[PDB]
Write an enzyme that holds these catalytic residues in place. Structure first.
Site, PDB file in Angstrom:
ATOM      1  CD  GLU A   1      11.129 -54.015 -17.714  1.00 23.47           C
ATOM      2  OE1 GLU A   1      10.640 -53.880 -19.009  1.00 23.47           O
ATOM      3  OE2 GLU A   1      11.556 -54.985 -17.323  1.00 23.47           O
TER       4      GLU A   1
ATOM      5  CD  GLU B   1       2.191 -49.220 -23.079  1.00 24.50           C
ATOM      6  OE1 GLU B   1       1.502 -48.230 -23.251  1.00 24.50           O
ATOM      7  OE2 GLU B   1       2.857 -49.764 -23.715  1.00 24.50           O
ATOM      8  CG  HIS B   2       7.260 -51.187 -21.496  1.00 24.02           C
ATOM      9  ND1 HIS B   2       8.343 -51.551 -22.135  1.00 24.02           N
ATOM     10  CD2 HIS B   2       6.900 -50.192 -22.568  1.00 24.02           C
ATOM     11  CE1 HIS B   2       7.933 -51.565 -23.404  1.00 24.02           C
ATOM     12  NE2 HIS B   2       7.294 -50.389 -23.708  1.00 24.02           N
TER      13      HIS B   2
ATOM     14  CD  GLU C   1       8.525 -49.287 -26.411  1.00 24.58           C
ATOM     15  OE1 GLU C   1       8.628 -49.623 -25.224  1.00 24.58           O
ATOM     16  OE2 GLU C   1       7.097 -49.376 -26.857  1.00 24.58           O
TER      17      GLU C   1
ATOM     18  CG  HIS D   1       6.334 -46.231 -22.940  1.00 28.51           C
ATOM     19  ND1 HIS D   1       5.545 -46.884 -23.780  1.00 28.51           N
ATOM     20  CD2 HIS D   1       7.330 -46.547 -23.401  1.00 28.51           C
ATOM     21  CE1 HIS D   1       6.152 -47.511 -24.515  1.00 28.51           C
ATOM     22  NE2 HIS D   1       7.441 -47.435 -24.155  1.00 28.51           N
TER      23      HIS D   1
HETATM   24 ZN   LIG Z   1       6.689 -49.261 -24.830  1.00 30.75          ZN
END
Ligand SMILES: [Zn+2]
Ligand SMILES: CCCCCCCCCCCCCCCCCC(=O)OC[C@H](COP(=O)([O-])OCC(O)COP(=O)([O-])OC[C@@H](COC(=O)CCCCCCCCCCCCCCCCC)OC(=O)CCCCCCCCCCCCCCCCC)OC(=O)CCCCCCCCCCCCCCCCC
Lengths: 76, 406, 122, 443
Positions: free
Chosen positions: D125, D55-56, D132, D52
């Site tokens: 991030e 992906e970010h 999130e 994840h």
């Molecule tokens: Zn995410």
């Protein structure tokens, strides 16, 4: 037959072979026949698997019936 | 990819050819909330679709559709009533027959209304009322346009039309000269023949008459404790490519997944509230009107106010001298955003609006995108900001600004 | 299970109806439900789902009139007396007003039952 | 004319990458997808949740082009970018106008081949990942399904959340992500598909131009083959009680089946037999499923849906119930499990109706370029090939009621189940009383 045959065409052949129609069978056999002309070093493992399964496989002529011996014993 | 209209046996048709195994059949009727005689009549009339007809009960219809493997879906919008049917290509004749029978002969049993139709409409009305953004946009439409498209779509909680009103409205609304048939299967000639054969016994009535839309402005205030909202609405005449390019220039969302974007509204939000209030602009084209709306949403009221002020300042400055690169990027994005709305089979505002007016439609409307100059966009923007705008505020009213303090 | 009657096969032949009219007249006079100011459809049993649903689909006027008729009949039955011969249920008002609704409900239920049991005969 | 149905061409490169495009002649939009066969299952306990984070990331500019220059490349040409990570595969796709596809493909190749993963980017991030994770928890369905996965395959890597624990998120470093990219982004496990205006030859040329440097993996494994040990189903229950919620979300599932299992379409047919329902449906009373009839008649619940989530060597098969008629949850669960267990004496007509509905639904879903590209990518990533509609039709048609009865008696009859409940679930009974309804005693 010079270009390598795509992998999604020669994967899980045994399950698909029965349902697969005649025309695809002739196409695959002809493509593999044209392919085997080249030296076998350049070929991938899946091509060899497909070729052997086509030739010395279980389908076609040498597809015998299996009899459950346990059923015979229990019936007796 | 484009609907080519015809007229067979005095019936409007709109064919389309696609290389797919599934077709469709939709009957767009000019019986929306704009033409309704009283509050909630159009919604109830839409709910009566696919009920007991003169040849087969509703249970038979549902069981037959389930056995044949098809989905029957309806749709009520502010200016249309749409009845769709998605199916495999084998049952096209059956589904055309079913749609023609539903439109032509459908007996209205009062106990059906009191048993099934009314509770479903009430449940849908409560589900709509639970949402906040949809209510805000509906109030924006109410304040912008006085009547016609300014009428509330869904059934009010304190209304209950009688069966006679719905019956007479259906009698004077379902006529050949007041709807069209849209099909997008893998064959057009066969579908056209079947539609001409079955949609032929419906009487030749008269098209429904409505007054031209009247445009005004006003502000409404409501209270809530959750997420705050603030919307701006600029009414405008019928849609033109300039408006689409302007809407794509405003932007608001992000082209790539996890980013802030680089359009005007995104830059305004970043410079004002450090990305604490997302601003999004969109356009809704109607038959003879359009509404360019800007939605500013967030949790902090002060950030909302600052973002609104900065966004209005940016919109005002947009009329001075637009750089060519901005127009180029806006056109490039607008072409994709407009074209992407035609791929889905189910109709939306853009496709229905294009199909209603046969003067331009989609053949020449897309071609006009590449002939937009900064002067045209500046003229459109300067014409928009002549008359006052309209606002709708949801949340803490002590901080959200009125129009005079933007 | 359900009430049964040979009320249609006799209607098929006009001669049987012409012969049986006076007997039916005498029997209906002898039944004496009209002496209480009632109608025949009021006496039908209402304890199943079909009749319960049917009674909720009548026009409001019919329901109110039926309620008043039943209440007056029971009030009379309390004291063991009947109305004078003037206030008797006339034949013109003694029509069938509940049978069509029950027929519609039974037809719906039978259609659903039919759909329920199906088979594939290739 | 009658036109035809376009066929999915398939071509492979020297390295092992596979290209599969469906070309529409008259179209103005195209979609390109690049998929990797490495989800969150390949992550160990220490470096969990790296997928994840990747992906970010990977959208923050490569070595050649920095951030705020990639976005300008994807805005001044009219394009969109997206990416999502499942528990077994990762997908990147980008659809745009028909005349701006090659630039997007080149940008995607640059993004995937090499990225400039910097410490400052990870530090930035971290907070967005935390936010999130915090915001996802609010939704009921995500929590319910995550708890079901955690309580079914407990212990296995397949039973962990995709996002991962908070400590894992905050303690992740550059080296872990770089190692994951190095050892999981190999040309043998990549895939590139398309559906739209672009043609097969053009995409093959683009792939040879750009995706020609991805080194193959050390071992020559296949696509979608199982990795690790087969997870063991562990029937259990989880109750995240909370009386504030006015609803009660409950999910019940039994052991499912894999992608390659020889009874897949039978399980799909059973799921279609059970069906879906919702109180807002226009034709709710007239549906032809007994469970829908009972639920609508007695107002037992709001809605319910059936799912048959499948994996490489396992899966799930159950239902998902949402209700607010508190106090009658036991009746709903009892009737649901009774309708489950009844499937051992299923009639021919119900099987025929389910077959027709499944055949229609498997085709009515694909109605856009993005959907077709996603379907092609998933089919190629999980199985190895995309089944033509003829093969699907032949496989579905062979199914009869005896096969359904056999499969139900094998897996639907008295067996262990996995439960997960969130909300006002007080009315729910114990585990034994729930399980007792999976078998009918009057046979
Ligand atoms: Zn995410
Ligand atoms: C004969 C032995 C058969 C056992 C009966 C049985 O399993 O229940 C009836 C059971 C009906 O349930 P089903 O639809 O088959 O599904 C059972 C479910 O597991 C549904 O089961 P459940 O978990 O919902 O619980 C039901 C079960 C749970 O009950 C118990 O656990 C029994 C507790 C002890 C009470 C007395 C014994 O109740 C019974 O077994 C009935 C008990 C009767 C109560 C008192 C009897 C008085 C006179 C009769 O089958 C019968 O009707 C048996 C006769 C069939 C004739 C043909």
């Amino acid at each position: 037959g010079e270009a390598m045959i795509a992998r999604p065409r020669l994967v899980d052949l045994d399950k698909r072979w029965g349902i697969m129609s005649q025309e695809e069978k002739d196409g695959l056999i002809t493509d593999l026949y044209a392919r085997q002309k080249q030296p076998w070093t350049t070929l991938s493992i899946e091509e060899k698997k497909a070729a052997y399964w086509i030739a010395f496989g279980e389908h076609g002529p040498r597809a015998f019936s299996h009899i459950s011996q346990k059923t015979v014993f229990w019936g007796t | 990819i484009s609907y080519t209209p015809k007229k067979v046996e005095g019936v409007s048709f709109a064919g389309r050819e696609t290389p797919t195994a599934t077709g469709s059949l939709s009957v767009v009727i000019n019986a929306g909330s704009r033409y309704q005689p009283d509050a909630g009549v159009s919604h109830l009339l839409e709910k009566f679709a696919f009920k007991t007809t003169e040849e087969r009960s509703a249970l038979r219809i549902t069981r037959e559709s389930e056995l044949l493997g098809g989905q029957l879906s309806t749709q009520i919008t502010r200016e249309h009533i749409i009845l769709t049917a998605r199916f495999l290509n084998e049952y096209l004749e059956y589904y055309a027959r079913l749609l023609a029978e539903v439109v032509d002969a459908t007996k209205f049993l009062p106990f059906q209304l009191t048993e099934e139709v009314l509770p479903t409409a009430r449940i849908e009305s409560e589900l709509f009322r639970e949402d906040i953004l949809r209510v805000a946009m509906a109030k924006l439409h109410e304040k912008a346009f006085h009547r016609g498209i300014g009428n509330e779509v869904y059934l009010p909680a304190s209304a209950s039309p009688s069966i006679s009103e719905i019956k007479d409205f259906a009698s004077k609304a379902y006529v050949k000269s007041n709807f069209s048939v849209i099909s997008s299967g893998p064959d057009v000639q066969k579908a056209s023949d079947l539609c001409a054969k079955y949609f032929a016994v419906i009487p030749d009535g008269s098209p429904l008459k409505s007054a031209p839309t009247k445009i005004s402005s006003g502000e409404s205030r409501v209270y809530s404790k959750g997420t705050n909202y603030f919307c701006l609405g600029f009414p405008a005449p019928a849609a033109s490519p300039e408006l689409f390019v302007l809407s794509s220039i405003l932007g608001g969302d992000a082209a790539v997944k996890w980013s802030h974007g680089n359009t005007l509204l995104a830059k305004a939000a970043g410079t004002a509230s450090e990305y604490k209030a997302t601003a999004v602009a969109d356009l809704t084209p109607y038959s003879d009107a359009s509404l360019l709306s800007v939605v500013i949403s967030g949790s902090c009221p002060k950030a909302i106010k600052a973002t609104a002020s900065e966004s209005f300042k940016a919109l005002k400055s947009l009329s001075s001298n637009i750089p060519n690169d901005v127009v180029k990027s806006g056109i490039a994005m607008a072409k994709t955003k407009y074209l992407s709305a035609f791929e889905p089979v189910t109709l939306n505002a853009i496709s229905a609006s294009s199909l209603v007016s046969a003067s331009k439609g989609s053949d020449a409307f897309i071609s006009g995108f590449d002939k937009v100059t900064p002067a045209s966009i500046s003229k459109v923007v300067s014409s928009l900001l002549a008359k006052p705008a309209s606002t709708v505020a949801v949340g803490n009213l002590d901080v959200l600004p009125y129009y005079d303090e933007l | 299970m359900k009430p049964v009657s040979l009320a249609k096969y006799i209607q098929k032949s006009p001669f049987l109806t012409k012969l049986l009219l006076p007997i039916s007249n005498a029997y209906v006079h002898l039944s004496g439900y009209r002496k209480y100011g009632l109608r025949y459809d009021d006496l039908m049993l209402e304890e199943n789902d079909d009749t319960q649903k049917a009674l909720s689909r009548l026009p409001k006027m019919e329901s109110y009139d039926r309620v008043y008729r039943i209440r007056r009949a029971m009030q009379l039955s309390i004291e063991n007396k009947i109305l004078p011969k003037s206030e008797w249920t006339k034949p013109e008002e003694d029509y069938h007003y509940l049978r069509p609704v029950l027929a519609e409900v039974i037809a719906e239920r039978k259609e659903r039952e039919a759909f329920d049991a199906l088979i594939v005969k290739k | 004319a009658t036109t035809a149905l376009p066929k999915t061409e398939t071509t492979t490169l020297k390295n092992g990458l596979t290209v599969a495009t469906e070309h529409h002649p008259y179209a103005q939009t195209a979609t390109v997808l690049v998929g990797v066969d490495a989800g969150s299952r390949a992550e160990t306990a220490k470096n969990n949740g790296a997928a994840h984070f990747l992906e970010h990331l990977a959208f923050k500019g490569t070595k050649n082009r920095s951030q705020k220059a990639l976005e300008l490349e994807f805005e001044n040409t009219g394009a969109h970018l997206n990416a999502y990570t499942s528990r077994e595969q990762t997908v990147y796709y980008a659809h745009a106008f028909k005349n701006a596809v090659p630039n997007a493909v080149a940008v995607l190749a640059d993004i995937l081949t090499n990225s400039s993963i910097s410490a400052s980017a990870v530090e930035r991030e971290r907070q967005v990942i935390l936010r999130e994770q915090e915001e996802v928890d609010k939704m009921a369905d995500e929590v319910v399904f995550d708890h079901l996965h955690a309580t079914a395959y407990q212990g296995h890597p397949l039973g962990r959340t995709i996002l991962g624990p908070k400590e894992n998120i905050e303690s992740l470093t550059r080296e872990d992500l770089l190692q994951y990219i190095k050892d999981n982004y190999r040309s043998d496990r990549m895939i590139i598909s398309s559906a739209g205006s672009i043609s097969h030859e053009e995409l093959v040329k683009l792939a040879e131009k750009y995706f020609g440097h991805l080194e193959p993996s050390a071992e020559q494994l296949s696509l979608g083959a199982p990795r690790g040990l087969k997870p063991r189903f562990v029937g259990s229950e989880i109750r995240a009680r909370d009386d504030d919620s006015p609803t009660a979300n409950i999910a019940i599932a039994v052991e499912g089946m894999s992608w390659k299992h020889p009874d897949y379409f039978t399980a799909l047919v059973m799921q279609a037999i059970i069906g879906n329902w919702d109180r807002a449906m226009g034709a709710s009373p007239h549906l032809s499923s007994r469970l829908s009839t009972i639920v609508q008649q007695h107002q037992l619940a709001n809605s319910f849906m059936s799912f048959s989530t499948s994996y490489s060597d396992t899966g799930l098969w159950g239902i998902y119930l949402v209700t607010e008629n508190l106090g009658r949850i036991d009746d709903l669960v009892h009737f649901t499990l009774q309708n489950w267990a009844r499937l051992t004496v299923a009639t021919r007509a119900e099987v025929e109706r389910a077959k027709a509905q499944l055949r229609a639904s498997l085709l009515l879903s694909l109605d856009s370029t993005t959907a077709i590209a996603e379907d092609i990518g998933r089919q190629l990533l999980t199985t190895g090939r995309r089944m033509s509609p003829q093969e699907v039709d032949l496989r579905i048609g062979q199914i009869t009621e005896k096969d359904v009865a056999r499969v139900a008696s094998e897996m639907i009859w008295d067996k262990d189940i996995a439960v997960s409940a969130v909300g006002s679930i007080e009315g729910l009974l114990d585990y034994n009383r729930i399980r007792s309804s999976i078998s009918m005693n009057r046979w």
